[PDB]
Amino acid sequence: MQENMLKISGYPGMLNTFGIAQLLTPYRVNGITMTGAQSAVVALENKFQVYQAVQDFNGKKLDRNHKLQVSSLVVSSPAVPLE
């Protein structure tokens, strides 16, 4: 499950768990644990969705007052070098 998990923060403090899931559209969210007013640990469906969600959302400016920080331990690990 480690490869399904990401950390997300920086969103508005008012968000509930459903609002955090809406931030991650269209990725499949299977679980969210809030860890502060503006931070949560999120389980997505698999490591590919985690990898893409970090790419899409880390550093994303939601508005002039909020910027997301998104991280995970997922590393793209091709067996042969990419073309």
Partner: protein, 82 residues
């Protein structure tokens, strides 16, 4: 279970690739929901589901007669029908 018209069956995958290799081919065309390789010859089978039907249609627009052609590979891609 799965999203209708968003899934592909893959043949002719170079045997040395893993799931990440296959992922990066399809990520060029859209968001990828799932991806797996299924280890006789120099080739293996695989499966890719796109995040949405529109993503899968973008893959379909980039195929040459059912083929996804790289510099060193030719993947034979068919719809998972349902």
């Amino acid at each position: 279970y799965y999203l209708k018209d968003a899934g592909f069956h893959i043949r002719n995958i170079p045997k040395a690739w893993n799931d990440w290799n296959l992922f990066h081919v399809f990520q060029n065309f859209g968001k990828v929901s799932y991806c797996r390789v299924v280890g006789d010859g120099q080739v293996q089978l695989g499966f890719v589901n796109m995040m949405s039907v529109a993503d899968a249609d973008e893959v379909r627009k980039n195929m040459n007669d059912g083929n996804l052609i790289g510099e060193n590979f030719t993947l034979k891609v068919t719809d998972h029908k349902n």
